[PDB]
Amino acid sequence: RSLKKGPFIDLHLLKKVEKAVESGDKKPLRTWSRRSTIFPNMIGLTIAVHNGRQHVPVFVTDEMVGHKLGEFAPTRTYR
């Protein structure tokens, strides 16, 4: 979908990656960036992805690299 010259990631979430790797793993990180591309330096962390009203924690897995964080947060409740 996106062009190959640079996978997109927000600046506020990229700063949250830097402190989490150095200072060790923490509580699940609340964010709103549903459009960021998962990089390999995030594997192991838990990021709470906002889905419209709440935050769902997503345990990052090795095969999640390349996809979006919005692909792990259902936006509507179905019954």
Partner 1 sequence: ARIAGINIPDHKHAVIALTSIYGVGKTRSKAILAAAGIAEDVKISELSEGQIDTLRDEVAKFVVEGDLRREISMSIKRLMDLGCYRGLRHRRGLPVRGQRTKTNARTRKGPRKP
Partner 2 sequence: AKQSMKAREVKRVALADKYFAKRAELKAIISDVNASDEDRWNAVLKLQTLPRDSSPSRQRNRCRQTGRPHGFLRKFGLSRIKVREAAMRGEIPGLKKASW
Partner RNA sequence: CGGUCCGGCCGGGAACUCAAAGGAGACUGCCAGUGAUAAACUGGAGGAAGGUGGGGAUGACGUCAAGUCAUCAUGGCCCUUACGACCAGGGCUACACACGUGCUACAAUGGCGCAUACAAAGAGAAGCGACCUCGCGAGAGCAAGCGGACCUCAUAAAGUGCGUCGUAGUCCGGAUUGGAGUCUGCAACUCGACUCCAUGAAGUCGGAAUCGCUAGUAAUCGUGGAUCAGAAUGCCACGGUG
User: Where does this chain bind partner 2 (CB under 8 A)?
Assistant: 5-6, 8, 10-11, 14
Single-letter code of the amino acid located at 19: K
Residues in the chain: 79
**Minimum CB–partner distance for residue 36 and partner 2 (Å):** 11
What is the secondary structure of 31-77 as a DSSP string?
A: E--TTPBPPGGGTT-EEEEE-SSSEEEEE--GGGTTSBGGGG---S-
Region binding partner 1 by CB under 8 A among candidate stretches 7-15, 22-30, 37-45, 58-66:
58-66
Binding mask 31-50 for RNA (x = CB under 7 A): -x-xx--------------x
